[PDB]
């Protein structure tokens, strides 16, 4: 055949892949964590959005830390050979590097480690996307008015994309009626640009939407008039388009 290029992930496998959505709204009383009103709006929005992208969506609600780990372990042990990618969306309370099960914390690294290049062979070389809607700390953004070769191996941390809802160390905002700022924006941008733009460019539009169109309203001066900027963390090695051929 003619000249060939390998700058984009192969997304024409028989299946796009799984989209696991963990929606934690109600937490055990003993933890002292508040209910996350509006998260069901996010979960439904994500289900519809990824369904249209042809992902096999699996929604899970109110999972304990043990159930989250068991779920991730089991999913990573499935045969993903006929799948192009993997998507996991986490909706819960959190802090830097941590997501909360209904009864306690789970290290994000523990979850993502199950999908390492060396631990999930059927996903090696394929994009593994983790969308995280959770706090990463307690900071508030006040805003501002405007040679050698051989034995071909790849890093076990390669091909991961972490789309965080907020910057490191910051709270993440969620509206009890409309859903989280980030998920609202992410779904809107995927619906409009998934058949046109490369994923990083779609996420950049999400960054702009969240950064410009949202500002908190609170009777508490400490939490009033605050802003938010999502954080795209890419260890991907190729361009990612949800469409093909």
């Amino acid at each position: 055949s003619g000249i060939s290029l390998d700058n984009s992930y192969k997304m024409d496998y028989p299946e796009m892949g799984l989209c696991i959505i963990i929606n934690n709204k109600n937490f055990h009383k003993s933890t002292g964590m508040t209910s996350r009103s509006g998260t069901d709006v996010d979960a439904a929005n994500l289900r519809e959005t990824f369904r249209n992208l042809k992902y096999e969506v699996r929604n899970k609600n109110d999972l304990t830390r043990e159930e989250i780990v068991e779920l991730m372990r089991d999913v990573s042990k499935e045969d993903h050979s006929k799948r192009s990618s993997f998507v996991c969306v986490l909706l819960s309370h959190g802090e830097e590097g941590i997501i909360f099960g209904t009864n306690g914390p789970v290290d994000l690294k523990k979850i993502t480690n199950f999908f390492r290049g060396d631990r999930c062979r059927s996903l090696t070389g394929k994009p593994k996307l983790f969308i995280i809607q959770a706090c990463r700390g307690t900071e508030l953004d006040c805003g501002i008015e405007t040679d050698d070769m051989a034995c071909h191996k790849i890093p076990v941390e390669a091909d991961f994309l972490y789309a965080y809802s907020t910057a490191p160390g910051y709270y993440s905002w969620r509206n009890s009626k409309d859903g989280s700022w980030f998920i609202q924006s992410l779904c809107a941008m995927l619906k409009q640009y998934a058949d046109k733009l490369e994923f990083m460019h779609i996420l950049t539009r999400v960054n702009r939407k969240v950064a410009t169109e949202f500002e908190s309203f609170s009777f508490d001066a400490t939490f009033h008039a605050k802003k938010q900027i999502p954080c795209i963390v890419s260890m991907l090695t190729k361009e990612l388009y949800f469409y093909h051929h």
Partner: peptide
């Protein structure tokens, strides 16, 4: 508006 609420924080997570």
């Amino acid at each position: 508006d609420e924080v997570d």
